Design a protein around this nucleic acid. Structure first.
Ligand SMILES: CC[C@H]1OC(=O)[C@@](C)(F)C(=O)[C@H](C)[C@@H](O[C@@H]2O[C@H](C)C[C@H](N(C)C)[C@H]2O)[C@](C)(OC)C[C@@H](C)C(=O)[C@H](C)[C@H]2N(CCCCn3cc(-c4cccc(N)c4)nn3)C(=O)O[C@]12C
Ligand SMILES: [Mg+2]
Ligand SMILES: [Mg+2]
Ligand SMILES: [Mg+2]
Ligand SMILES: [Mg+2]
Ligand SMILES: [Mg+2]
Ligand SMILES: [Mg+2]
Ligand SMILES: [Mg+2]
Ligand SMILES: [Mg+2]
Ligand SMILES: [Mg+2]
Ligand SMILES: [Mg+2]
Ligand SMILES: [Mg+2]
Ligand SMILES: [Mg+2]
Ligand SMILES: [Mg+2]
Ligand SMILES: [Mg+2]
Ligand SMILES: [Mg+2]
Ligand SMILES: [Mg+2]
Ligand SMILES: [Mg+2]
Ligand SMILES: [Mg+2]
Ligand SMILES: [Mg+2]
Ligand SMILES: [Mg+2]
Ligand SMILES: [Mg+2]
Ligand SMILES: [Mg+2]
Ligand SMILES: [Zn+2]
Lengths: 122, 37, 215, 175
RNA sequence: GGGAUAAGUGCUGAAAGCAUCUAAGCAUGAAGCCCCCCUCAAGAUGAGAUUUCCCAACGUUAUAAGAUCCCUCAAAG
RNA sequence: UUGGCACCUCGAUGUCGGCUCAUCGCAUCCUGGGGCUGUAGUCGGUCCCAAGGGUUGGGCUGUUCGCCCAUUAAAGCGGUACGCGAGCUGGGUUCAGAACGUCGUGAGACAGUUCGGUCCCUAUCCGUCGUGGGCGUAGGAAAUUUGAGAGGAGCUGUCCUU
RNA sequence: AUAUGUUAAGUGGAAAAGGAUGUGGCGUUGCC
């Protein structure tokens, strides 16, 4: 359950460490995003030498949430943290590596390269 | 359609008619179609 | 085209063919009997009257609704049936396809049927604007003395009155509600139970009416 | 001159049975019936019919002209009928007979079906030529109008369904 | 989804030989109008309808069907 | 709107902005229908019909306004005591303290600024939201009902295919 | 109500420049 001003750790090597949610995309008056949704965010903290610098306004896809998601079979997955991956226009990650497990739901959103790069899909 | 209080022929083929109480101009040139209003 | 009366027992879940989780409402629809056929000729419109739950027979000095009174006993005896606790009409059925006094079993509905379920919603008592009409609170701090009040109720000299339909505190719930396009998940002939996808209005033990969806 | 005052030469096959104010024209090609104006005289000879007006007001001249025109149209439709011709311009634009109804393929995702009415018969000769024949002039015109309005002609290439002999205003497109 | 329409689009058609959607007629055409959907509703004093139950004597006294008072309560408050 | 006039109110008709809650107009922001185009298409321009529904979360400022960030189908313009303080707030503005600039010999003052600075009221009538008692409805009653009429609802994006 | 006529816009029952084969009364005239 990500909203405006929510801060998320970044789960790639793009150079961003922490971002702050500026906007949840997808229609007027939408308040909350979850796994697989795309957000607009600003980089609050960044690793020196990285591509993405502090202060940049970027787009990211949520790959882990504490609220988690409910699946069609009545089963649930929840994670201990909220994390996102910075993406280009065509949904590909801006970085080369993905860290941490990601939810299966990214397959439905066609974030296939992020799925392939992740150490674990759950 | 031109909708304006001043309806009058623009070219020589324009015809002034009255349809359902509205003064109109009909013409082969579609730019000259007018309805008073 | 179909209709039946039942009591809401409670909510549970079943697993579909694909392993999907389907929340369901258990409706028990035993003892349904056609009590009367109303026709255009006599009543001005076509309907069947269905009694749902059997009552005790009449006795002198009965103090409660558990025992049929004489008018009810006579009305039911006209259909060769026991007196019934709940009686409702169905105008969506074909009057020809029913005989007075016949039973209405759950097997009239089949799995996959699309139904409309009508019942009386749960009562909430006297409720304020926040809960009854979904209004927003005032600030809880910053000096505010406005938390759960309804706010302004009109303008001024114009119109010097409150308009009809202004949303205000009052009794909430206990209203007739129809939920459309539910589905029959399963019909169980024993126990005379219909499993309805999703939730239906009302408290447990409340009466519900099930009809083939009009839409 | 004048239209309503003009006389009508009825056909020898057509039996213009003047049912009083109402009229009914049974002919070789069909029958027609519509009540003419209730303020007109329709006195006729054995081989001819000539309408006369009883007044001189504006309504008199207007009603006289329209009544005589309607009578002449009924006579000509009983005798010879009426033909409306539609032409289809455009690659892949075709029409065909699905029995009595007419199917048009005019570039939409779907075909359009034009159903036949009483005393109306359709006919599509080639792939891209259609025809609407019948006794009643107004009905033939209306059906042809609907067929044309399924996909009216366009200015840049003349594509669409046009009347035979229709002048379509053309415009160069700034491609 | 149906019906009638708006701006429009026409057909037939004169007044006005022509032409013309209009004057008589004939159609078609909007998230809009009236219905279709949900809820309330006969104090609708115009107070409606159906089924069933009950039937007194001499204003009074006691009653019928039916209810209430009182009491145990909750799914209601 | 800025005004002009000084007709109601000076034995008091609480002023700006916001909050809560709306309601109406249409000169229509979106969505629907359509004519013209210097309309190829994709997009536009302009005009006509149309008020059913919809029409945003932040940075700055007391602000309205406005600029900006990010969205959205769209982020319409107006009326209702510039709607709404016996519904709220009280940042601003017409209060006593103090200070600066400035003016004044001065007490003091302001096409100015700055820090601080009590928001009372148990609802009688109409109005509104709920909920009961009486009587009427040509016998009394139990239940099921028709619907004159009334209210509610009414939005729209993206993708695939063609 | 009576006589003669005008209007077809509910004009009557709130408005202008301007526009218009709406309809009625008057004329001076031209071709035929
Ligand atoms: C909180 C109680 C006071 O209310 C108010 O102060 C207010 C909030 F109600 C108030 O200011 C009202 C609204 C005022 O009326 C406005 O006056 C304006 C000039 C015009 C306006 N309208 C017409 C445009 C009027 O509505 C005024 C003049 O009160 C000062 C009303 C008059 C009748 C007035 O003086 C009354 C008597 C006033 N007052 C002097 C308070 C004087 C200030 N004060 C004293 C105390 C106090 C005293 C003793 C003990 C304690 N603990 C506290 N607390 N506050 C009291 O002793 O009591 C109240 C009612
Ligand atoms: Mg001009
Ligand atoms: Mg709030
Ligand atoms: Mg408080
Ligand atoms: Mg009654
Ligand atoms: Mg003023
Ligand atoms: Mg004076
Ligand atoms: Mg004053
Ligand atoms: Mg006074
Ligand atoms: Mg308008
Ligand atoms: Mg609207
Ligand atoms: Mg708006
Ligand atoms: Mg105000
Ligand atoms: Mg205030
Ligand atoms: Mg007030
Ligand atoms: Mg202050
Ligand atoms: Mg000095
Ligand atoms: Mg302070
Ligand atoms: Mg009704
Ligand atoms: Mg009423
Ligand atoms: Mg949509
Ligand atoms: Mg009028
Ligand atoms: Mg008027
Ligand atoms: Zn012209």
């Amino acid at each position: 359950m990500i909203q405006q001003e929510t801060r998320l750790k970044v789960a790639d090597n793009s150079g961003a460490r922490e971002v702050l949610t500026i906007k949840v995309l997808g229609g007027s008056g939408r308040k909350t995003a979850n796994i697989g949704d795309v957000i607009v965010c600003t980089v609050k903290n960044a690793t020196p030498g990285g591509v993405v610098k502090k202060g940049d306004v970027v787009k990211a896809v949520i790959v882990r949430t504490k609220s988690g998601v409910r699946r069609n079979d009545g089963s649930y997955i929840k994670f201990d943290e909220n994390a996102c991956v910075i993406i280009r226009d065509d949904k590909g990650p801006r970085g080369t590596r993905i860290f941490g497990p990601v939810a299966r739901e990214l397959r439905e959103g066609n974030f296939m390269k992020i799925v392939s790069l992740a150490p674990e899909v759950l | 359609m031109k909708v304006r209080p001043s309806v009058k022929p623009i070219c020589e083929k324009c015809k002034v008619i009255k349809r359902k109480g509205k003064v109109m101009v009909i013409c082969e040139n579609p730019k000259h179609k007018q309805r008073q209003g | 085209t179909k209709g039946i009366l039942g009591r809401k027992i409670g909510m549970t879940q079943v697993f579909g063919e694909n392993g999907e989780l389907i929340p369901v409402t258990v409706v028990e629809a035993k003892e349904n009997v056609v009590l009367q056929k109303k026709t255009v000729e006599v009543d001005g419109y076509n309907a069947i009257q269905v009694g749902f739950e059997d009552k005790k027979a009449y006795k002198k000095d009965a103090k409660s609704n558990k025992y049929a009174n004489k008018p009810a006993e006579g009305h039911a005896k006209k259909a060769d049936a026991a007196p019934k606790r709940f009686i409702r009409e169905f105008r969506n059925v074909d009057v020809d396809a029913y005989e007075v006094g016949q039973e209405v079993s759950v097997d009239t509905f089949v799995a996959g049927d699309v139904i409309d379920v009508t019942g009386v919603s749960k009562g909430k008592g006297f409720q304020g604007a926040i809960k009854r009409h979904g209004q927003s609170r005032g600030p809880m701090s910053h000096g505010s003395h406005f938390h759960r009040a309804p706010g302004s109720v009109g303008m001024a000299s114009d119109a010097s009155r409150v308009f009809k339909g202004q949303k205000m505190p009052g009794r909430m719930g206990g209203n007739t509600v129809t939920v459309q396009n539910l589905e029959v998940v399963q019909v169980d002939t024993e126990n005379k139970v219909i499993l309805v996808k999703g939730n239906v209005p009302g408290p447990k033990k409340g009466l519900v009416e099930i009809r083939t969806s009009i839409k | 001159s004048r239209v309503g005052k003009k006389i009508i030469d009825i056909p020898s096959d057509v039996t213009v049975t003047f049912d009083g104010n109402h009229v009914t024209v049974k002919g070789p090609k069909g029958e027609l019936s519509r009540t003419l104006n209730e303020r007109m005289t329709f006195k006729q000879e054995e081989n001819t019919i000539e309408v006369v007006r009883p007044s001189d007001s504006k309504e008199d001249r207007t009603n006289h002209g329209t009544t005589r025109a309607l009578l002449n149209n009924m006579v000509q439709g009983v005798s010879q009928g009426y033909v409306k011709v539609l032409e289809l311009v455009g690659v892949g634009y075709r029409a065909q007979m699905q029995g009595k109804d007419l199917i048009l393929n005019v570039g939409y995702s779907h075909p359009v079906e034009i159903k036949a009415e009483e005393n109306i018969t359709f006919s599509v000769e080639k792939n891209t030529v259609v025809k609407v024949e019948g006794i009643s002039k107004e009905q033939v015109g209306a059906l042809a109008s609907n067929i044309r309005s399924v996909r009216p002609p366009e200015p840049y290439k003349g594509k669409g369904i046009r009347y035979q002999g229709e002048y379509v205003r053309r415009k160069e497109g700034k491609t």
